[PDB]
Each structure stands twice: as structure tokens, then as C-alpha cells.
Amino acid sequence: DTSTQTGTDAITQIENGDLFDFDFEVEPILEVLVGKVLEQ
Amino acid sequence: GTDAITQIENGDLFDFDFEVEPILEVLVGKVLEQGLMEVLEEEELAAM
């Protein structure tokens, strides 16, 4: 009956010889080769 | 309407291969190198 409606990029790199101390590592190679040569 | 609590538990959905891959890989490389090292050492000992 009714109806309705309605943050900046940063670049870091590692450089040679920083972390690597050449002397403390090349010591044993020298020791070894010389021991070999001597004893042998 | 009905309240159910479901929780995934422990010791379930377990695989085996992927759990052993890392230890396998590390041990294989390690053992290879260690075997080689011991070979060298024993050679030198044999010389002595």
C-alpha cells in the first residue's frame, strides 16, 4: 500500500688490507717451508 | 556459532631431508679436508 526510497640509502664496502694483516698470516708459511727444507 | 580453538602443535608436519641438508653439507666438506690433512700428516710421519 506504501512505498519508500532513500630511509636514505647508505653504501658501505670492505677494502683490502683492512681486516687482513698480511704479516700475522704469512709468518707460518715461512716457518713451514723453512722447516721442511731444513729437516729434509 | 560454535567456537573451536585449533593450534598447530610440536612434532608435526615434520620433514627429514631439509633438516639434514646443512649438517650434511658442512660435515662433508669438513671431512673431506680433514681426511686430506690426516693423509698428509701420516705421509710425513711415515717418512720419519
Place this chain on the structure above:
Amino acid sequence: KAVIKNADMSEEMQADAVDCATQALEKYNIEKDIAAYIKKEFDRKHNPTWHCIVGRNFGSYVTHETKHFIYFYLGQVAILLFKS
């Protein structure tokens, strides 16, 4: 300010409906609760039964009972009220 876009109600009853709708909008948030409040009010004041339907977007055709069928827009929503 407010509107009534259609009505079948005796003036004082219509003013009562309006004041009831105001006090409902004041004391309610959910819709079905406001509808229940208004319908309970009118049914208890104007001789049951009633029915109320409250919404925001809905098209309506019904077969009401004479002088018991009002449609009005307040605040957000539109409210339809008609007695069985």
C-alpha cells in the same frame, strides 16, 4: 532541523516519534538497537504492535495500516516505522 518525507501519524504522535528518535540517536550507536528502542517505545505508547526498519540505503514497498506509517530522515540514517 529535520525532515519527514512521508507520514501517517497524528501530529502529537509524530512529534513524540521525533523526540523518541532524538533520544534514541542520543543513547545508541548500533542500528538494530536504535530500531528496537524506537519500536518498543511506540508499541508501548501507541498500542502495539509495531515494526521498525532503520538503514541508509534501501528501497521500500509495504502495505501498512492507516495512520501508522512514517518515513523520515535524521542525521545519517533513514527510519521507517509502521504498525502491524
Place this chain on the structure above:
Amino acid sequence: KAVIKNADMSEEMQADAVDCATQALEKYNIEKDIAAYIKKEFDRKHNPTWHCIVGRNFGSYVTHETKHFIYFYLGQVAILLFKS
């Protein structure tokens, strides 16, 4: 496919109603048109008492008799059909 949100009505009559409603939606495309079409179809089909409302955002609490209440979804629209 129409979902029945709520109903107190015998199954065959509910299928009748959903069928007639989908037909009405095929025929007319104004809310109140759908409402009146279904209302008349239902009244002719079963009994004189009827009340069909169609919408999208309507929450309504209405006293209803037994076996004569259905609230169901047609696509996006929501239909409420009862006996007056």
C-alpha cells in the same frame, strides 16, 4: 546464487520466494519496483499477508508471525519478506 541469512518459513515456499525474487530482479531494476513486484507476486502465490523490503544498508527488527519470515541475499541486494 541466493543465500538465506535467516528464515522461519517452509522450504518449498522459500524456494518459491527465491525464484520469484530472481525473476523480479530480472524484470525490474529499481529497488522499490523489486519490492512491490515480489510483494504482489508472493501475495498472489500464497496468502494475502505480505511485506517485502529490498535494500543494501538496512537493519530492521520486526515482529513476525510463524512460518512467514525470510531474509536472504540476491547478488548485492538484500530481501526481507514476511506476512503482514
Place this chain on the structure above:
Amino acid sequence: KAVIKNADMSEEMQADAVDCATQALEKYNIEKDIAAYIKKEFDRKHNPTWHCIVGRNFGSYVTHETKHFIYFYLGQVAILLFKS
């Protein structure tokens, strides 16, 4: 190798779910991709108003209609699917 951990559902629908889960694991790998595909399929195939969680570690407390609730360790992916 399905192990239905906990479900309130008809047996046939459970078997259908296991099948659907099989082709689900066939089609996608992402968890939520699987769940969305599954929910679309179970809205099409089964009754509507579902909620899906195809997870690894979770604890939920949901309220569902009767005989529509499922949690199964399909493969070794625990899939939970239920109806509102």
C-alpha cells in the same frame, strides 16, 4: 597422507576438501595464495561466508555454524577452512 586434525563437517565435504587441497598444492605454493584460491573455490563449490588460514604455526579461536569447520594437516601444510 592427509590427517584431519579437527573438523565439524560432513564426511563427503571433507573428502572433497582433501581433493581440492590436492589440486591447490598442485597449482600454487604461497600460503595465502593457496588460501585465497581455496576460499574462492569453496565459495563457488561449497556454501558461502568462509574464513581460511593455510598456515604453519598459529592458534585461533573462531565461532562457526554447525558442521562447517575444518583443520587438517594436508601434506605438512595445516589448512583451516570454515564457514561463518
Place this chain on the structure above:
Amino acid sequence: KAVIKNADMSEEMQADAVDCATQALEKYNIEKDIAAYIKKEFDRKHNPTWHCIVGRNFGSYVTHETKHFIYFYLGQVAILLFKS
């Protein structure tokens, strides 16, 4: 201590949920216990139909009542609370 991963919800409802969830966390630590606590609390506070998903490893795809949806990591357990 709650990174809101994704939430459509009023700030006040978020805070009330957070308070009741703090009481839940002080009560329990297991995810299923957390979900039970949370859903019981929001059943007591609001309309019982609610849905909470708590866990360490889960991704959902859910149907939530509008303006009721929150997902935040509260410590190590993540809680997603919405009302059905």
C-alpha cells in the same frame, strides 16, 4: 610493543582490545590460550561474533565486519582481531 601490521579500526577500539589483550598476555602465553582469552573477552565486551588469529607463523584472508580489523605483533605473538 605492538607493531600494527595491518588494521582498519578506530584507535579507541584498538586500545580497548590492547588492554584486554594485555590482561590475556598476563594470564597466558600459548597462542591457542591467547585466542580463547581474546575471543571470550570480546564476546563479553561486544557482540559475541568475533574472530581473532594469534600465532607466530600464519597468514590469513578473512571477511571482517567493517571498521573492525586489527593485526599487530604484541611481543612475539602476533594478534589479529576483528569482529565477525
Place this chain on the structure above:
Amino acid sequence: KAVIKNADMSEEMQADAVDCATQALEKYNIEKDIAAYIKKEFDRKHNPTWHCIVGRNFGSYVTHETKHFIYFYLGQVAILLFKS
């Protein structure tokens, strides 16, 4: 121990970082064990999410958020830390 070449973080989190870095470098050989220990411990204490690159030959460009950034040498390894 953490020799912080470039750091953006607080004192306590830095101190825990240095202790964990010292223990990982002294006790463990491979990178990923240290990385996972660090990540879990800094989720546990520092903040729940983190991103790190530890290596010996690694170059990276990062947009860290303040109060979370590190770029430091330990022993002979480069450790890059940022939250995200």
C-alpha cells in the same frame, strides 16, 4: 667484540651486539650460524625485525632507519646491520 666503524644505535643494544659478536666469532666457524643467532637474539632484545649481511667479501648499500645501523669489522669479517 664489536669495533664499531660506523654505528647508529643505543648503548645497551650495542653492548649486547658486541657480546654476541664476540661469542659467535670465537665459538663458531660458518657465517649463517652467527647470523641466525644474532637475528634471533636481536629480535629477542633489540627489536622484533632486523636485516643483516655478514661476510668477508660483501658490498652493500642500505637505507637504515635511525637508531638501527651498524657497519663494523671484527677479526677479519665485515658485519652490516640495519633494521627493516
Place this chain on the structure above:
Amino acid sequence: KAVIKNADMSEEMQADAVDCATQALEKYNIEKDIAAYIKKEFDRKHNPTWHCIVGRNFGSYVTHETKHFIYFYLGQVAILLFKS
């Protein structure tokens, strides 16, 4: 040639990353610089979140947003391109 150490992206995204890396390799001779160049080019090129690491020795455990990651080697240099 190319080895994909880690991936969490679509095949197309990984192919785009490899192509991007080879394009980068003709511009930047410093590895942090390559990372910066790639990060800019994928920032405008892709979804704004990204992270890039390039090198010959690194191993990680990052909680990264799902579906966006690649980590692959060209020649002897690895390029990692991802979204947080």
C-alpha cells in the same frame, strides 16, 4: 655463469634482477657503488622497498617480507636484490 643462491620471487622478477645486475656491471666499478646504483635503479624501477648486497663472501638470515627476493651470482660476483 649464474647460480641462484637464494630466491623468494617470481621467475620474471629473478630474470629482471639478473638483467639489472648485468646492466649495472657496465657502470659501477666499486661494489658499494654498484649496490647504490642498483638500489636507485630498482627504487624507481620497482616496488619502493628494496635491499641490495653484492659480493664474493657473505651468508645471511633475514626476516624479509614475503614474495620479493633474489640472490644470484654473475661471474664471480653475487647480487642480492630484495624488498623489505
Place this chain on the structure above:
Amino acid sequence: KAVIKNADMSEEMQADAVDCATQALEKYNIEKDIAAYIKKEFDRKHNPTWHCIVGRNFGSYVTHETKHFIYFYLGQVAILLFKS
């Protein structure tokens, strides 16, 4: 057998009225004529004046003159009889 629900009358005059009504019903079919006989005899018999009703359905609330107010039932049809 006349039963007298409401009584303000001399049990002697009550019995009088019952027997009168019996005679009238014996001597009438039309309740206007039952009234006729009853009234005339109960005036001559029962010390005029009087007043009578004989009906199936009516309710009354009357203030009478002391000691002359009777409301009784002849079988199925009720009868009131009293004085000014």
C-alpha cells in the same frame, strides 16, 4: 433449575423469580415474550414495580435501591431482575 449468581433479594422472592422464569420459558419461545410473561407475573407476584432483562450477551454496572437487585441465570440465558 435456576442458578442465581448475583443476589440482593429475599431467598423467598428469589425462589419466586425462579419459578416465574420457569413458567415464562414454558410459555414462550421469543425472549421478548419470555420477558413479557416473566415481567407481568413477577409484577403481579413479586410486589410491583420491577424491571427485567433476558439475554445472551451483556454486562452491567448498576446502582440500585437496597434489597431489590438480582442477577441470575436460567440455564443458558441469563436474566437480571430488579426494582427502581
Place this chain on the structure above:
Amino acid sequence: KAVIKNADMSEEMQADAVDCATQALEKYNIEKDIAAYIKKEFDRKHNPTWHCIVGRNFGSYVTHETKHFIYFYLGQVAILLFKS
């Protein structure tokens, strides 16, 4: 709607009584109360005493006196009213 079957009084008093009866039907429903109220209002306005009978089904003779004895309907509630 209402027809005065028998009028034995002034049309002024008849209008009076009609309005009185409208008020009566307003105030009460049980015919006993309605008659009570009408009779009170009338023995006030119209010189005690009168008697009021109301019902759907009766029939009677009365040897009434002038300016009394109205007999009308309202809807179908027949109302007789006369002063002893």
C-alpha cells in the same frame, strides 16, 4: 458508522450521549467498564439516576418515561440507556 436505533430524548442530549459514548469506547474495552463510565458521566450530567445496558446480543421491552431511553449502535456495540 453509528445509528441511533431508538431515540426517546432531546437530540441535544443525544449528541451529548454520542460524544460520551465515543469517550467511553476510548477509555475502556470491557463493556462493563464502558457502561459504568457512561452512566457515571450521565447521572452527573443528567440528573441521577439512569441505567446503561450495552452488548452485542439482547432484546427487551421497557415502560420508560420521557427524555430517556436512547438505543443506538457504535460499530456493532448496541447501547440502551434509560432512567428508571
Place this chain on the structure above:
Amino acid sequence: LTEEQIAEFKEAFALFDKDGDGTITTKELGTVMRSLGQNPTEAELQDMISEVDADGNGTIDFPEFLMLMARKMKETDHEDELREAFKVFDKDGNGFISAAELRHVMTNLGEKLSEEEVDEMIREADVDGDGQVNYEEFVRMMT
């Protein structure tokens, strides 16, 4: 101009001819071009305008309007170029597109749309705010 095009242009021009004098203001020239079914850019519009109102009267007559119309009419994009354009904002060729990326590009690149235009677009297209847009239907509505 053919009889049909002349009629169409008279119809639209009179719709926009605020006072019927037989000319239209330069301000609504774009509307007319758009109103006639052409989707020209703001650059071409500004060029045509510049390339036509030297007199400074700030009006356009039917003859010049017909010349501009025939010119612009010669270069009309097809439906596929548009589909492709939509898919360009559809990262993975799935037929959907994040709403945030769409809004960001629409309001940040090219001939930056206004906030009103983006809001109207989202509203008028009945697209689900927290969904994936089946750009094929949105495009059909917009085609």
C-alpha cells in the same frame, strides 16, 4: 562535416552555449572535445586553444570548431592501446592492480589528476577499496 556530425556538434555546442550566441568560451573547449567522445590530453587542448584565440575575443565559432574537431578526430586511440595502458599499472599480468600504486601514479605522474577526479573515479567505478581491481570491467565502464 557530415549532417550527423554537424547535428551532434550543434547539440553539444548549444548545451554548452550558455547564451545561444553561436560561439563557445575557450574554457569549456576541452569539455566539448571530451563531450564529443574524444579523449585528448591537456597539452593538446592548451595547444589548440593557444593556436586559435589570437584575436583575444575568447570565443569559438562553428567553422573553427569544425576544423579543430576534424583535426583532433583524425588521431583517435583504439581500445587495445587503452587496455595495454591499464595493464601497465597491473604489475603482474593478472588483471588486477594495487589501489595504492594506481592512486600514486595517477596523482603523481603525467598529467596529474586532481584528488576530486581520483575520488570520483574510485566512487563511480564501484571498486572494492581493499581488493584487487579487475581493470577489465573498470575499463569497460570507462570505455
Place this chain on the structure above:
Amino acid sequence: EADRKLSRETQTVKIKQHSQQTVREQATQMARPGVLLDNDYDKEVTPGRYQERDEIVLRSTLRIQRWVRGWLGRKRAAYLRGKKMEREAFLRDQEARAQSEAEEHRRREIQRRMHPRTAADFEVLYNELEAWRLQETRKIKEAGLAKEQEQQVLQQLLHKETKLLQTIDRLKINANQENKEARIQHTLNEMSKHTPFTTRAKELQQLYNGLNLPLLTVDERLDVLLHVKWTVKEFDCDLTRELVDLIDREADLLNRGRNPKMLEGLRKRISSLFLNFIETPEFNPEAVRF
């Protein structure tokens, strides 16, 4: 006595779906000769071209902006067309209704011209005729001729005038009769708008419209005459005598059998005497109205 039982309520509202995601991790292990070793479940790839997509998307945005401008113009045009067609319907239908009302007034004037029911309509006709006479004589005078046939033209004109005036008189008689009948019906109506006297008046109105009835028969006619005679026989003074007399004359001369077409004046006299019976205070307890 009865009461209601229960009710129901459903708050129809929007319900959308939103997605939430979780962090996914990957590991990369650099491969070097030594302790490091690894199972191969990997893939190889060729780079291909890399993106310069920015200029493509910029051109795409320009194109889409052109497209959106055309579409927005089209939608504004559609709304303008809708309002245009609305206003055109407005104007056309308003003018059509105006034309319809004008035609109705025209037809009303033509009906006035056919029969002048109103007294004013008769005054209008009279003044119109006199204007006609004056215009005729003005033309005849400005003719300025026929000093011996002017009078014959005048006689013809006067005969026309006389004929028209007699027609006007006839129409006036007819209108007076019909106005009389109408006002009688109006009085009968005033005798209808539930007092017992008023109920009897409604009954008598039914009776009078039964007396003035055509398409009679004989059994129904005799029956209704019997009904009306029974009704009349309550007051029974002297008019009822002659009304019944004429009714009985007809009743007899109908029992014997005579063509009802020959019963015209008698039906008229019966109806007149019954209306006169009705037009009486005691005989119709309402005649105080007039």
C-alpha cells in the same frame, strides 16, 4: 484475547575481505673450496634486458590522462543531456497539459453553445443575439441601397430574429424543467446526508427514484407498486388516496393488458403525486429542510 510471540532482526551491512602477510626468509651461502660443500637443487639463468620503464609508464600515464579527460567530459555531457531531456520533457508536457486544458475550455464553451443550461448562459445568448441584430443592421445600413428593397431585406432579417427568439424561449422552458428536476434531486440529496427520521428519508429517496423509473416490466412493476403502497399506507391521509387510485388504475389496465407505451401520462401523474406525498412534513419527517 491474544498476544504476540517473537521477532527477528538482521543488520544488513557491507562486508569486505582484507589480506595480511608474513615475513619470508631466504639463505644464500657463498661457495669456496674447503669446509664449504653443497647439494645442487639450483637453477641457472640468462639476464635479458633490464629496466627505462619509467618513461614508458610516464607515456602511459599521459595517455590514460587523455583518456580520463575524454571520459570525464563524456560523463559531464551525459549528465547535461539528462538534465536537458528532463527539461524538454518538462516544457513539452507542460505545454501539452496547457493545450489540453484550453481544449477542455473550448469544448465546455461549445457545450454551453449547444444547450444554455445556466441562466447566465441564457443572458449570454440574449446579449449575443442582440449584438448579432445590431451588426446585421449596421451592415445593412452601411450598404446604403435598395430604397425599396431595403424593407424586404429588413423583413427577412426580422423573421430570422423572431424565429431565433422563439427558439430561445423553447430552450428556456426546457432548461427550466431540467433545472427543476435537478433541484428536486438536490433536495432529495439533502434528505440523505443516521437518525431514524433521516433513515426513513433515505428510504423514501430510494422509493422516489424507484417511482421515477423507466424500463419497467409488470411483475416487478406490480411488486414495487405493492411495496410502495405498503409503505404509503402508514400515514394514509388523502393524497395517498389519489396516488394509489392512479396506481391502481394502471395496475388494473395492466392486468387486463395494455401497451405500457400507452402508459406515459399516468406514470407521470403517479410520480408527481408520490413526490407531493414525499414533500410533506407529517408524511416525510424531514420536510422542514425546505
Place this chain on the structure above:
Amino acid sequence: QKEGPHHTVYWTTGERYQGSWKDNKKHGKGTVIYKNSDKYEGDWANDMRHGLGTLWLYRDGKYVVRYNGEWRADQPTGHGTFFADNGDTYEGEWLNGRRHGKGRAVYGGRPVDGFGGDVYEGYFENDVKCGPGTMMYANGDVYEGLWAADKKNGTGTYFYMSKGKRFDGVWADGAIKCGTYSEI
């Protein structure tokens, strides 16, 4: 002629009139009692008019004053007051009954008190009002607008003084059909 303030003029049951008499009837200040069991005292004028007049069927008539006001052509035809027993009190300028004139009809008993059923202020047209007026319902509410024998579809203003609102609109053949409720 029958005139002069005669002691009485006697007919069979007649007219019981005392007062200035001429033309064989009441003319001047005098009271006429007639067959409607009622006596009214007024400055009579052939009953073609009447000055101030009080009409009252008293004690036998059982009433105090039936009408008080001036009369013109034995219709009050001006300011007149009618008092029903408890029904109403009509005070207004009415000619030939309450057929025209602007006046107040208190449609309620107990009129001196606020308990009165209902007041009225405005224009009358044949009992009905048919005009723009205003009525305070005796609960605070007032109505200001157009009337057409009631049920008039006219813009009116109703004042909820208790609430503090006012409703302006169209009483479309009924108490309410549409309008705007606002806060004055």
C-alpha cells in the same frame, strides 16, 4: 396597537415578555420568554434586532445563561458568548449562528483552570474555522496556520515549547504528512 411598557400581554400560552413594548411585540429593553422554554432579556428591536441580550432556560430549563451578547435580526450577529454545561465556551463575533466571525472556542470543560480540554483562537467560517489562526492545545503546544474545516493541507507551525522545537509544514488532509521539525 399594544404598546407601552405594559404589565403583560397575554395570549394562550403566548410570549411572556416584560419590558418596553410597541408594535404589539417586544421593542426596547425587555425580556421575552418563548416556547423554546427560554427567556432572554435584551434591548429588543422587533426581533429584527436586539441590543445586549441574555438567553437562558433557567431552573425549569435547568441552565444559567444560554447565550449572552448582542443580537441582530434575532441572530446574535456580533460578539456573543455561548456556554455549554461543560462542553465548551464560545466567545466570538458570529452572525446567524457561528457562521462567520473571529473568536475563541474553548472545547474543554474546567475552562478557568489549565485542565481545560482545549482552547482556540482564530477565524470561524460556519462552525468550522476556514482561515489562518492559532490554537494553544492547553499542554503548551500551539498551532499557527491555515484551516479548511480541519484537515487543511497548509504550511503551519506547531510549537513543542516543552521540548523547544517547532514543526512547520503541510497538514495534508491530516494532522501530519510532511514538514520540517526544527529548534526555533
